[PDB]
Design an enzyme around this catalytic site. Structure first.
Site, mmCIF file in Angstrom:
data_model
loop_
_atom_site.group_PDB
_atom_site.id
_atom_site.type_symbol
_atom_site.label_atom_id
_atom_site.label_comp_id
_atom_site.label_asym_id
_atom_site.label_seq_id
_atom_site.Cartn_x
_atom_site.Cartn_y
_atom_site.Cartn_z
ATOM 1 N N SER A 105 0.749 -1.056 -0.057
ATOM 2 C CA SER A 105 0.079 -0.083 -0.072
ATOM 3 C C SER A 105 1.069 1.361 0.095
ATOM 4 O O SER A 105 1.700 1.425 0.702
ATOM 5 C CB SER A 105 -0.873 0.109 1.409
ATOM 6 N N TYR A 129 -1.676 5.490 -5.376
ATOM 7 C CA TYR A 129 -2.510 6.549 -5.357
ATOM 8 C C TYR A 129 -1.933 7.547 -6.035
ATOM 9 O O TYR A 129 -0.778 7.973 -5.747
ATOM 10 C CB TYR A 129 -2.935 6.893 -3.932
ATOM 11 N N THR A 155 -4.318 2.639 -8.290
ATOM 12 C CA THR A 155 -5.687 2.558 -7.922
ATOM 13 C C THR A 155 -6.754 3.395 -8.681
ATOM 14 O O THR A 155 -6.078 4.685 -8.752
ATOM 15 C CB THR A 155 -5.986 2.772 -6.284
ATOM 16 N N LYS A 227 -6.182 -0.970 -11.012
ATOM 17 C CA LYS A 227 -6.802 -1.707 -9.927
ATOM 18 C C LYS A 227 -8.200 -1.053 -9.760
ATOM 19 O O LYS A 227 -8.078 0.103 -9.252
ATOM 20 C CB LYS A 227 -5.774 -1.789 -8.856
ATOM 21 N N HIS A 251 -12.589 -2.882 -4.645
ATOM 22 C CA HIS A 251 -11.889 -2.097 -3.379
ATOM 23 C C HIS A 251 -12.315 -2.797 -2.048
ATOM 24 O O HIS A 251 -12.613 -2.092 -0.904
ATOM 25 C CB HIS A 251 -12.108 -0.712 -3.392
HETATM 26 C C1 LIG Z 1 -8.090 -2.583 5.530
HETATM 27 C C2 LIG Z 1 -8.285 -2.350 4.044
HETATM 28 C C3 LIG Z 1 -7.286 -1.455 3.561
HETATM 29 C C4 LIG Z 1 -7.081 -1.223 2.399
HETATM 30 N N1 LIG Z 1 -6.119 -0.506 2.027
HETATM 31 C C5 LIG Z 1 -6.011 -0.206 0.695
HETATM 32 C C6 LIG Z 1 -4.993 0.637 0.188
HETATM 33 O O1 LIG Z 1 -4.236 1.232 0.766
HETATM 34 N N2 LIG Z 1 -4.913 0.607 -1.263
HETATM 35 C C7 LIG Z 1 -5.611 0.301 -2.073
HETATM 36 O O2 LIG Z 1 -5.498 0.202 -3.498
HETATM 37 N N3 LIG Z 1 -6.578 -0.721 -1.764
HETATM 38 C C8 LIG Z 1 -6.871 -0.996 -0.322
HETATM 39 N N4 LIG Z 1 -7.950 -1.838 -0.099
HETATM 40 C C9 LIG Z 1 -8.654 -2.618 -0.824
HETATM 41 C C10 LIG Z 1 -7.628 -3.940 -1.099
HETATM 42 O O3 LIG Z 1 -6.370 -3.853 -1.971
HETATM 43 C C11 LIG Z 1 -8.400 -5.051 -1.933
HETATM 44 O O4 LIG Z 1 -9.028 -4.509 -2.958
HETATM 45 C C12 LIG Z 1 -9.361 -5.720 -0.717
HETATM 46 O O5 LIG Z 1 -8.994 -5.809 0.602
HETATM 47 C C13 LIG Z 1 -9.865 -7.128 -1.511
HETATM 48 O O6 LIG Z 1 -11.077 -7.695 -0.606
HETATM 49 P P1 LIG Z 1 -10.787 -8.855 0.311
HETATM 50 O O7 LIG Z 1 -10.501 -8.037 1.796
HETATM 51 O O8 LIG Z 1 -12.082 -9.175 0.415
HETATM 52 O O9 LIG Z 1 -9.737 -9.747 0.311
HETATM 53 C C14 LIG Z 1 -7.963 -2.122 1.443
HETATM 54 C C15 LIG Z 1 -9.027 -3.055 1.958
HETATM 55 C C16 LIG Z 1 -9.014 -3.265 3.360
HETATM 56 C C17 LIG Z 1 -9.923 -4.213 3.591
#
Ligand SMILES: Cc1cc2nc3c(=O)[nH]c(=O)nc-3n(C[C@H](O)[C@H](O)[C@H](O)COP(=O)(O)O)c2cc1C
Ligand SMILES: CC(C)NCc1ccc(N(C)C)cc1
Length: 353
Positions: A105, A129, A155, A227, A251
């Site tokens: 991230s 980002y 993203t 993404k 997301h």
């Molecule tokens: C706690 C959390 C933090 C996240 N932080 C980011 C991030 O910093 N950048 C990003 O592009 N997506 C972020 N996401 C989206 C994740 O990359 C991913 O798309 C998502 O967790 C997938 O679904 P899952 O939790 O059901 O496996 C985040 C998701 C969660 C649950």
């Protein structure tokens, strides 16, 4: 004790402070898509072949030309040091042990350099980002390149933060001793409504457009994956812009509520790209059979978000290793019981909706 991914979540709820557990757990608004990311996998049924010789199952595959031990990779989840003191360092060490890749991230509680030092041999990618400050954005890309990261996942579904109700109720912010360690200033480091929503509104550019993708494509020769794409027309536009993959993602159901489950939109996207680039999935992967269904529908690999955080919350590096080993073994068993010796023979006739 903990023998499936659901057990790790239950344990995490019991040990984490409420605001931290809620931040990680939550989806947007009424959490319709959050439930559907899971429910949708159950609607896709498996049609196993028998008597194929599955003594020697090979889970290995390749993501953007780099070998991995299994089609199961760690997705970007911000601020992992809230879950466990070692955070992203623990995560990358576990990925190195497993032979899989970690998507780091931009909002990590450990720097690009710190994570490369903890996992020098691990396959690592940067989730990017686009900050209003393009110099900050460029610095992240340059560090990723210098530090041996192998792709950029940009993203594209977050011009603003989704509305996660519990974070507004809890006035979510980082714990006092932690920061977003890729940044220098109080505001960009998220120094402690939802704090994170306000951070995004201050830092992240809501104007970004396909012109910005053109800029990013000129900026780096690294592979770039879009993404957060949910439409076939957008996936074709990403291919036209010379990007190198699509990560079909809502997301983790945290942005716009009421979009489809990712497993349900995957086939349209696979069809739209006509084999020109790899297509990946995230959202709702909890079981080996989820991985099998995504590959049958055309995904090269899947990414896991929340399960990793729950691994951290249990036992740091060991907890993340355990979660990944559970998924690996469930996936091996699913392949074997379906008649699949390797990932290349996981075909569309294995599933029906
Ligand atoms: C706690 C959390 C933090 C996240 N932080 C980011 C991030 O910093 N950048 C990003 O592009 N997506 C972020 N996401 C989206 C994740 O990359 C991913 O798309 C998502 O967790 C997938 O679904 P899952 O939790 O059901 O496996 C985040 C998701 C969660 C649950
Ligand atoms: C595998 C490792 C994470 N130890 C915990 C553990 C997890 C799963 C299983 N199996 C047999 C379903 C057994 C034990």
């Amino acid at each position: 004790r903990l023998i499936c991914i659901n057990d790790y979540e239950q344990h995490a709820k019991s040990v984490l402070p409420k605001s931290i557990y809620d931040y990680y757990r939550s989806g947007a608004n009424d959490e319709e898509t959050l439930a559907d990311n899971i429910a949708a996998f159950s609607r896709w049924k498996l049609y196993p072949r028998m008597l194929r010789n599955v003594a020697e199952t090979d889970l290995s595959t390749s993501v953007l030309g780099q070998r991995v031990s299994m089609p199961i990779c760690v997705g970007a989840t911000a601020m992992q040091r809230m879950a466990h003191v070692d955070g992203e360092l623990a995560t990358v060490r576990a990925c190195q042990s497993l032979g899989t890749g970690m998507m780091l991230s931009s909002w990590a509680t450990s720097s690009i350099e710190e994570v490369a030092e903890a996992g020098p041999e691990a396959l690592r990618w940067l989730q990017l980002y686009i900050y209003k400050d393009r110099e900050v954005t460029k610095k992240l890309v340059r560090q990723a390149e210098k530090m041996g990261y192998k792709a950029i996942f940009v993203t594209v579904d977050t011009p603003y933060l989704g509305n996660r109700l519990d974070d507004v109720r809890n006035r979510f912010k980082l714990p006092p001793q932690l920061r977003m360690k890729n940044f220098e200033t109080s505001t960009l480091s998220f120094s402690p409504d939802s704090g994170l929503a306000a951070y995004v509104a201050k830092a992240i550019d809501p104007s970004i457009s396909w012109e910005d993708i053109k800029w990013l494509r000129r900026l780096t020769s690294l592979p770039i994956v879009a993404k957060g794409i949910l439409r076939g027309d957008d996936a074709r536009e990403a291919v036209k812009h010379g990007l190198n993959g699509i990560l079909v993602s809502n997301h983790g159901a945290r942005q716009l509520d009421g979009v489809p489950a990712t497993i349900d939109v995957l086939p349209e996207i696979v069809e739209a790209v006509e084999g020109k680039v790899e297509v990946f999935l995230d959202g709702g992967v909890r079981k080996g059979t989820d991985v099998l269904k995504a590959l049958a529908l055309g995904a090269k690999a899947v990414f896991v978000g929340r399960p990793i955080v729950w691994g951290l919350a249990f036992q740091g590096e060991k907890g993340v290793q355990d979660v990944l080993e559970i998924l690996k073994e469930e996936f091996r068993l699913a392949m074997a019981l379906s008649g699949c010796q390797n990932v290349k023979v996981i075909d569309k006739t294995l599933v029906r909706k």
